[PDB]
Design a protein around this motif. Structure first.
Motif: not given
Ligand SMILES: NC(=O)C1=CN([C@@H]2O[C@H](COP(=O)(O)OP(=O)(O)OC[C@H]3O[C@@H](n4cnc5c(N)ncnc54)[C@H](O)[C@@H]3O)[C@@H](O)[C@H]2O)C=CC1
Ligand SMILES: NC(=O)C1=CN([C@@H]2O[C@H](COP(=O)(O)OP(=O)(O)OC[C@H]3O[C@@H](n4cnc5c(N)ncnc54)[C@H](O)[C@@H]3O)[C@@H](O)[C@H]2O)C=CC1
Ligand SMILES: NC(=O)C1=CN([C@@H]2O[C@H](COP(=O)(O)OP(=O)(O)OC[C@H]3O[C@@H](n4cnc5c(N)ncnc54)[C@H](O)[C@@H]3O)[C@@H](O)[C@H]2O)C=CC1
Ligand SMILES: CC(=O)N[C@H]1[C@@H](OP(=O)(O)OP(=O)(O)OC[C@H]2O[C@@H](n3ccc(=O)[nH]c3=O)[C@H](O)[C@@H]2O)O[C@H](C(=O)O)[C@@H](O)[C@@H]1O
Ligand SMILES: CC(=O)N[C@H]1[C@@H](OP(=O)(O)OP(=O)(O)OC[C@H]2O[C@@H](n3ccc(=O)[nH]c3=O)[C@H](O)[C@@H]2O)O[C@H](C(=O)O)[C@@H](O)[C@@H]1O
Ligand SMILES: CC(=O)N[C@H]1[C@@H](OP(=O)(O)OP(=O)(O)OC[C@H]2O[C@@H](n3ccc(=O)[nH]c3=O)[C@H](O)[C@@H]2O)O[C@H](C(=O)O)[C@@H](O)[C@@H]1O
Lengths: 342, 342, 347
Positions: A73-74, A95-96, A171-175
């Motif tokens: 998880x990013x 990424x990211x 927190x883990x991912x974004x959209x």
């Protein structure tokens, strides 16, 4: 001897890593693998016979991979990269590289300080289609660049977000921008140049997630070009378009397809031998489509054998991360956000 | 009897109006022509045999058109239209209806108060292609609309602005958004619905003119959709595209070509008869390219003849005029500008 | 209609300090123009002016317009009257030559222009330095692309105005009537920004009254950005010790470097271009010429007015020409007062 890679996170993208390495498995090997999930942990050793660790710290205490690949998880990338750097090993981050600007900054520092390599996976850059544009631009063929638009009109149903608790979280991912289109937000800087500022609107229009599934950013580069990037994971009923169009004083290009796989428009004031490599560049990118890692890991492995500089280092990854942050501060704040960030 | 039109301004677009009125020769005729420039007044005379004046005030003291068509520099439109209405005649104003928001509201109040009719020329709304999109949107076939993208990538060389001093000036014309792209800015409100706010960048990247030759606006609709309109007159080496793309929950349409004239993508969850009207809409819209005045007049005449009401009356013109104004304010001030305007 | 078969009839409104250059410029074209009328609110300056001219005297503008027949009125009054005088002149149907600047308020300057437009009369704004031979040569190089991409522009107005200057008349240094260093003295220099270099995108300014007892600023600075991307500044003070030190413009580009110094952009000092041009040989001669009409610039400006009125020309600085610098001054004064960047064009 061979580069010893270890893999942290045995999930959906893990297989392309195992895939790209094994494809070089004569200048390198996959020696260890790590996952906090018994099943996926099992499954992956079952699949490769590398030595299984059920957390990163155990793997760092005991393993000896020259370089750890982060495919978790990013939002865990920056903390993992820091721990990996503290144990004195190189880092290849998916990424990211982070979900937060300050975490991205810390990862790069921590790796600097430990005198270790930090690579961020940006495989799309190695599309033949994209390479052609990059050289076009590098050689001045566009002359002044004026307008640039990127569309990412893809699809992700609720089930896709529900397959994993981390998915769609700030927190883990974004959209849609931070996860899915981070590859395209990367083109902005890498292909056309440094961005001066952005303004964005985003929202969660239909999925049950925290982050955005839809958005727009207007953009202004330092050399003065303007443009937009337009992004939704709500397209009906499936990926429609992953594109970039670039218009300049003496050049016009559009790279179309579902993933910048198809050059649709290529027009230039003066000829160059690349004018004839178009149908087949569309060829190599479309058949590597979704499998750019092998080519990615050839630069990694060459940089680690002291041969090359890394194509995408931590600082490069910061370029795109600064932009996502700008876009996220703009959307949340309702204000133009200029670069570079503090 | 036949409706009696007068034309004010016998310049480059004059011929298309001349063209289109003659094409309803049995319901109307061009009786009066007017230009303050001796030379093209002469030729517009030779070519139509209508009665020439050399100022609008003389044409209005001496002439008797039921409707005057303003094809002068856009900045003149509101002031001519006030004088016309003051003289009890109907107003057909070329686009855009004004270059200043305030002038636009003023011309509307004078037509209201004189009891005259005010039409603004948006011929593109008649495109058979866009009429189908309109109808799908009104029948609710898209479900919630999520993302909208519009590109006007066209070509005006310096010699085009060089032809007439008025051109590219803030007072008399505006730039690429207010002149060429207003038909597209027109689409955002007309097809998709009221806009809530915009953020824009614009610039004069290459042309020697006052106003912008290049720009982008990010947009947010009141119903939640987001989008952008990207524009440039600096395209190499001639017109590339004029396109609108709309993505909703159960619909995906894209109208491509150089002028919203070929439906390129059309996909919907449930089927509908119009699905079969598509090849027809495309042929008919593309075949009238450069020449949609004929179709616009039909409604104008149907309405003066007490049949219909105007497809594009004065307040309708105000809609794009307000957006154009928010785009210009936003580009000048560097902030999001919300609607409705004061 | 042009005035082609008889000398132009001019009227002068305001017989104060600059009136003498007008009277003498007009007289320097005695064959194409004559001064027939003069108007002042001050019994005694009018007195001096009649005896001085033999023109018909009038003690108010209404009277002069009711009983006079001048083809054009010259506005030589305190700057904040020009708008209102120009509007009444135009309503009585004659041309207007307004002294700089055309107004002290943005809206008044717009109203002046509209009024002349709808009266169908000419509105000229005096900007004599435009005819300066030195600045003409720069203008020519800028117009033929000799500088390439323009990058950096600086303008300095380091002049001297003692308290006794301001006290000479009540209107001087007031916001309503005059404005400060920028609007009165350096306006010829603010004018060069757009006229020479191109459209201004925005300004940021600091101004202050650092020593004079007046309302408006005696010292200031503006940072500029142009739409084509050059940057620069305009640096202005009326407090220079002990008398005028500098009136200059420096333009820096990809293939051109130009500096026009002197007390009043009257002497070209630096002049370097990638590719040669006959004008290169015209410099010393242009310096000597511009310098030689230092203080007496009006004679040259009126040449153009008379031509335009005779039907020969369009004016070099009409109403809208004059709004261009009024708009920058407005932007500079709003920026100084509010502490924010002010972008153009203005609402
Ligand atoms: N460059 C590219 O094309 C792609 C990049 N990615 C990125 O790679 C990462 C891949 O995520 P996915 O594979 O697609 O989601 P994922 O959910 O399939 O990967 C899950 C794996 O990581 C594990 N994990 C969770 N916490 C952990 C921890 N503390 N330590 C070790 N393992 C842990 C999960 O239990 C599972 O083993 C993300 O950052 C995603 O952005 C993903 C797909 C493609
Ligand atoms: N709806 C459409 O597709 C098109 C609309 N337009 C619009 O039509 C108007 C005409 O544009 P053009 O034909 O391109 O430019 P133009 O310069 O070719 O036409 C100008 C004419 O008006 C005359 N003129 C100027 N002042 C006048 C006055 N006070 N009274 C009478 N005549 C006067 C000029 O001498 C000239 O002959 C503009 O509003 C423009 O945006 C133009 C082309 C297409
Ligand atoms: N272009 C240039 O180089 C110069 C321009 N100017 C400008 O020209 C104007 C000249 O100001 P000055 O001669 O220096 O100051 P001023 O005080 O010497 O001249 C003022 C004259 O206007 C008269 N006056 C006042 N109110 C009047 C009214 N309602 N009607 C008629 N006359 C009236 C005053 O009684 C006085 O005789 C100002 O705008 C100044 O900015 C002044 C000097 C040089
Ligand atoms: C190089 C590149 O673009 N990488 C990004 C990209 O990868 P990858 O190409 O593997 O996506 P993949 O196409 O498999 O579809 C994923 C799911 O979408 C659903 N999906 C997909 C397509 C579609 O048309 N409909 C659909 O439902 C279906 O459920 C699929 O399983 O998508 C990743 C992601 O989203 O997590 C990003 O993390 C990557 O950075
Ligand atoms: C329906 C619609 O789009 N209306 C707009 C449109 O009208 P009209 O249909 O006439 O465009 P038209 O394409 O013929 O060429 C115009 C010039 O472009 C030059 N032009 C054009 C294309 C090109 O590739 N190169 C080029 O130089 C060419 O030399 C021409 O002289 O262009 C007008 C304008 O811009 O003044 C706008 O005011 C209208 O709102
Ligand atoms: C072309 C041009 O620059 N025009 C502007 C200019 O005109 P003009 O050339 O007449 O100025 P002039 O040089 O006589 O000095 C004026 C007084 O300054 C004092 N002054 C002057 C110089 C000096 O070193 N010391 C000094 O005290 C001394 O008292 C002078 O009497 O000054 C006008 C003004 O200020 O009202 C501006 O309005 C003009 O727009």
């Amino acid at each position: 001897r061979k580069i010893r890679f270890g893999l942290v996170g045995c999930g959906r993208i893990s297989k392309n890593h195992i895939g790209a390495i094994a494809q070089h498995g004569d200048r390198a090997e996959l020696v260890e693998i790590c996952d906090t999930n018994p099943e996926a942990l099992q499954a992956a050793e079952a699949a490769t016979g590398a030595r299984p660790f059920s957390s990163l710290s155990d793997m760092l205490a005991q393993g000896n991979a020259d370089a750890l690949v982060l495919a978790t998880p990013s939002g865990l990338h920056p903390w993992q990269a820091i721990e990996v750097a503290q144990a004195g090993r190189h880092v290849v981050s998916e990424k990211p590289m982070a979900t937060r600007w300050e975490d991205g900054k810390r990862m790069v520092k921590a790796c600097d300080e430990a005198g270790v390599r930090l690579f961020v996976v940006k495989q799309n850059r190695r599309n033949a289609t994209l390479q052609l544009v990059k050289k076009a631009i590098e050689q001045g063929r566009f002359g002044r660049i004026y307008m640039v638009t990127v569309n990412v009109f893809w699809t992700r149903p609720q089930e896709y977000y529900d397959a994993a608790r981390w998915r769609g979280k700030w927190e883990w991912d974004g959209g849609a921008f931070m996860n899915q289109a981070s590859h395209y937000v990367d083109l902005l800087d890498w292909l056309v140049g440094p961005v001066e500022s952005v303004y964005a609107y985003t929202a969660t229009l239909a999925r049950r997630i925290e982050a955005e599934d839809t958005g727009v950013a207007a953009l202004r580069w330092r050399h003065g070009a303007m443009g937009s990037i337009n992004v939704t994971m709500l397209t009906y009923p499936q990926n429609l378009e992953g594109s970039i169009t670039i218009l300049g004083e003496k050049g016009t290009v559009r790279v179309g397809g579902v993933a910048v796989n198809r050059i649709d428009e290529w027009k230039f004031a003066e000829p160059h031998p690349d004018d004839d490599k178009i149908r087949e560049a569309n060829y190599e990118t479309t058949s590597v489509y979704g499998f750019g890692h092998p080519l990615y890991y050839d630069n990694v492995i060459n940089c680690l054998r002291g041969d090359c500089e890394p194509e995408t280092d931590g600082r490069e990854g910061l370029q795109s991360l600064a932009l996502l942050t700008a876009i996220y501060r703009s959307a949340r704040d309702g204000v133009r956000i200029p670069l570079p960030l503090d």
